[PDB]
Structure formats: structure tokens, C-alpha cells
Amino acid sequence: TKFPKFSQDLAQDPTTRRIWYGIATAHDFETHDGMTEENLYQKIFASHFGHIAIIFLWTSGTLFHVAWQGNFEQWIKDPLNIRPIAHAIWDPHFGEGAVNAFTQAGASNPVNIAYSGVYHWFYTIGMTTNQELYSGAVFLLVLASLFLFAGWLHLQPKFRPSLAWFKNAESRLNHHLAGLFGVSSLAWAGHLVHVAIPEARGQHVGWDNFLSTPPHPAGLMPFFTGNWGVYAADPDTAGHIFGTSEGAGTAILTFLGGFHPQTESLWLTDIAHHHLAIAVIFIIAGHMYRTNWGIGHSIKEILNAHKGPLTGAGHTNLYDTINNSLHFQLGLALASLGVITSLVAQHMYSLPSYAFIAQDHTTQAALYTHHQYIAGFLMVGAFAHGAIFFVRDYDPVANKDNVLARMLEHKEALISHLSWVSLFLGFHTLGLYVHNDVVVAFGTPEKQILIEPVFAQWIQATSGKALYGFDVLLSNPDSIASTTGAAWLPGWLDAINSGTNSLFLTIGPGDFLVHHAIALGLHTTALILIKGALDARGSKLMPDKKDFGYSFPCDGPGRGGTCDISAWDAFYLAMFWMLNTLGWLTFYWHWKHLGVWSGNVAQFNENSTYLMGWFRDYLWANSAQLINGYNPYGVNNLSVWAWMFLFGHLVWATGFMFLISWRGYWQELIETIVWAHERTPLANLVRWKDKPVALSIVQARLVGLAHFTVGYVLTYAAFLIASTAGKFG
């Protein structure tokens, strides 16, 4: 009736479907009745202010609970032995055993151990007291308030931006490149130079004295005189003790490379010069597009000029296509953010920046797994909204014969070749694993097919790793690349050849097989997503798929052949492969590091070449402590993870019910329940307002996928944390 107000059709639905679909379409503003393009952008703009405020509030909570209930001040005095505390536990359901078990990390009350790495982050950037953490938390509350007010303000009549304002691509790129990226990076370099670096050298710098405490004794005169070399002289010595003046230098900008010997993290002076350098580039990059002064580039002119004889119209009219389609823009943003998020995961574990975090193995595992899963979700979303663009926004006439239109032209070639490579990888990668399993099973492990990852090893050699003896480029002292006199080379070569870190881990046949398994997952997930996007507008089975929508009901009479072919169904299928691919790579990352951390790299090297090795040495072996979190003899600090481990297993299985069964069985079952209610004395008096009905076909798949995904994530998270935490503190 009333709810949903944005859909009269849904509001008139007399069944419980009204409630479910009202929630699932709440944020699809484009489909709301009476929605206009100008009001669409303004509503999105205000919603974005809300999301930013939530992020600041979330960050404020992290700071507040650490300062209030954590052990930050105790932790900084012994980072390698004290376990950081996330927040206190107040659970009246706890028994005597649980209270003692969770009274840990030196606390006087039950607490949870933090694995987010915030302790290492806060300490590295110069925070040393609970008061400073408290000040930051309060500051973020005010900052969150400002954006909440801004969202409300820019929804008022006089302050609503015009549609042309939202379409000014050139101005936004200039501002966000130079200002949002460049100035922010420059400002962060300022914090590092004026606060973080002095704190690492035992010098207190805060708001009370930063004005009277020059970051460098030479002042700013060298900067304006061109004598920039002064800021790099006298760097921190290899014997520097982080947080103290012992062995500390005076340089504020360096290019040492490698890791700080004690903290096993990147030099802060290098990080400062890094963020200063990219700030200059970003600021320059932000002057490329013309806004109001004639100079600069027109993006429309650039796109319409890049066309050749092999791609027809080339990039013609793509400025209008992208600028007028929010789904195209969202797809590009998600795809770019997805790639960057994986880059963060890949380069943070190998090139850690936070002091002592390389020795917090559970935190490293949690962070890599966390951001890789986020990357996987972003990549799926990018293709999902790419498919939505084709269904809703793509205009064949405007994009006639351009690169976009030609992608739809050779879609059969694209899909067929993607099918082949997936089959090509799957047949032979699985075959080699099974070959090794059988020969090892028959007591002949010497008959395994063990392929040396020569190409990857060669790349490591080009960066200076001399283990493989390829003697190429940076691994070759006589190479022109090696004799350049680069400042970072001595530090970098030491780090890559130390063998005591995760920088270019040594790889072997085990790494070869799993990397090709990852390639199978990537290509297969892309195949499903790309097929959904390219076939979204129609196929031979359903030539008129475009005029039905991204997701459409396929349970109507005469629509038996319209099921499973919507672009939404491609997303649904791709989610399973995304989770599977992430499972393979996270298993790979964790098992390999377990050997590296414990020094027994031989286990992974020898047992990762057949699947029974993963089953036995990784899954079975590392579950022992987890499943003993609680047992007939008592409980320990892993009891919660053991309970969550079974909880994830249960939620995962519950998803099978929605994924396997179909609506018809449950609709008739509900009818019997409805029959019983209407005939039970004293109960038929109570009458429902919405007629109970079984879940729709699309809804059941979404619900089933939700239980599947939640159980998938929760199960591994408990195993990942408990197995690592149990082994290493």
C-alpha cells in the first residue's frame, strides 16, 4: 500500500513479495517512479555525502575503542610481544571458562585481539598516547558531521547543483587529480616530514610545538635555493632503534630503498619523498583539461581523433556515451578500484610500510585476505554494471561502428576463444595435479611432472635476485641497469637477497601449478561475466532480451525458455567462480607463508604439487587448534573462532536449500500451512495483511547466494585467523 513509495506497482502487490522487492530496489534510483535525470544526480550526490560520513564514523569508532579499551600505550613499548587489543567484551552469556580464556593480552577484563593492523599504522604515523587517539576520534566525529550537513545542504533548493555541473568532466578531473590526489599526497608528505619522522627519532612534535620545531635544521632556504641535496644527507643508520634517537639521522627525504633493519618496514624518509614526488606529478596531471581559460585538452576532441583503419570509427562519440551513462562510469570505477585493491594486497605483504607489522603474521594474513576479497567483489561489480550499461544506456546509433559497437560484433569470437582458454587451462592444470596425486599415491613421487616457473624466476632475477643464477640486468653487476649509480640499488639488492622477508619469495614447481589454477579462475570468471555483458542485449535463444531489463521475472506463463539467460544470472554464476578463485589464491598465500614464517618452506615446496598435500598438510593439519577452541576439557581464546567456524559451515549449507530447490515445491507447502492456520480455532482470528508466498526464482538465488557467500567468508576467516593465531601467539 504505502511501502514502497517509489514503486506504485510493488505497493499494489498483495503478497509478501512487496516487502522483499521494496528493499531490493530501494537504491536503484533510475527505476523509481517520476525520477528525473537532474534529480537522480542530486540524490546520488547527497547519498555519497552519507557514505563518506559513515566511513569517518567507522574510523572514529576504531580510534575510540582502541584508546578507551585497548592497550596501545603498553603495546608501543613492546610491539613484538604484546598482542594489540581491539575492544572489550561485555557478554552476559559468558561462563567462567570463557571469561578467563578471553582475559588476555594483559587486560583485566575479557577482550578481543585486534588483527586489523591499526596499532602498527597509528604507531608508525607518530601517534603514541591514548589522548592523541582520542583527539583523532573526536576530530573524525566533527568531520563526519560536516559531510552529513553538506549532504543535507546540497539537497536544499538554492544549493542543488545543476545537471550541467555534474556533467563537467574536464573540471572534475582537473580538481580531483591536482587537488584530491595531488594536494592530499603533498599534505601527507607534510605530516610525515613534520610529525611522523621526528616521532620515529624520539622527538615529540604535536599541535603545541610544530610551529616552532623545523623538521630540518637547514630550514626552507635550501628548498628555494635549489640545494635539495641537504635534505637527504645524514639518513637514519642501520642501527637506528625506531622511536628513539639512538642511531637516528636528520634527513627528511631519502631514496635508500629496502627495509628498516629493526622494524622490517620501508624507511619513513623514503615514504615521505615518495608522497612528495607523486604529489608533483598529480598536480601537473591536473592541468591537462580545459575548464575556463582556453588552455588544456578537450576529452571529446581527443576521443574523436583516435581512430584507425582497423577499428572503424575508433573512439568516436565515447565522450557522450561515458559522460551520459552512470553505469559505464561506475563500471570503470569499480574495475579500476578492483585492480588497485589487489595491487594494495600484493605490495603491502611484500613491501610493508608499518613498523613491526611484518612480524604480526595473523595481521598480515588477515589484511591480504581482506583486500583480495574486496578486490574480487569489486571486479564482479564492474562487469555487472558493465552489463547494466548495455541493457539500459547503450545507444547503437550513437556508438555506430566505434570500438564499443565492434565488441558486440565479434562477441561470438570473444566468447568462443574465452571458452577455449578456460578449457585449455582446466584440462591440463587439473590433469597435472591428478597425475602427481596418482604417482605420489603409488609411492613414486619422482615421477611427478614438476615444471620450474622459469619465466617468473627470470623476472625476479631482473630485479636483482641472484638465487637462480640467471645473471640478467639488476642481477648482473655489469649490466648498464646495474651501474647507473641509483641511490636505492644497494638497499633494494640487500632486501631482495636477504631471504628473511616476503619480497619476491622463492618459487618452484608448486607455485607454477597454483598460478595456472589462478589463471583458470580469472579466465573462467571473466568468461561468465563477459558472456553476460555481451549477450545482455539479446541472443538467438531470446532475440528480444534488451527490452526486459538486467533482471526480469521468468516464471510467467509461456516464458519457460527465458530463464537463466538474464545478465543478472551471469552475475549470479560468476560469484561462485569469484569465490572459488579467491579461495585458491588465499589458500596459496596462507600455506606458503606458514612455511616461510616457521622456516619450513620445504613442506609447501614438496607437498604443494599434488592435491592431497593441500588437503592434508594445509587444511587438515592447520585445523587442529581451531577445532579445539572448545572441547570436553575446557575452552581457550580460540573458542569464538571455533564457534564461528561451525557457524560459517552452517550458513554456507543453508544456502544450498535456496540454490537447489525451486519455488513450486515451497509454494504448495506454504498453501498447506495457510490451510492449517485458517482452520485452527482461536488462531484463524488473526489475519495477515500480506498473503504469504514462496520466494521468487530470482529472490531465492539471491538469498541462496547470500548465505553461500557469508558462510564462505566467515568459515575461512575463522580458519585463517585461528590457525595463524594459534601457531604464532
Partner: protein, 31 residues
Amino acid sequence: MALSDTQILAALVVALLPAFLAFRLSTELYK
């Protein structure tokens, strides 16, 4: 040193500001 009781209570009072503003923004978005 550890945070004082007044500091914890003071944070709660400050948190009423984003709470009130969040209510206004949500109501405005509902329109």
C-alpha cells in the same frame, strides 16, 4: 594514561551531533 570518565562521556555528547545530522539527511533523502 588511560582516558577519564569525563572524556568518554564527552565523546557521547559530541556523537549526538552526527546522529542529529544523520537523521536530517536521511529524512531529506526520503523526500
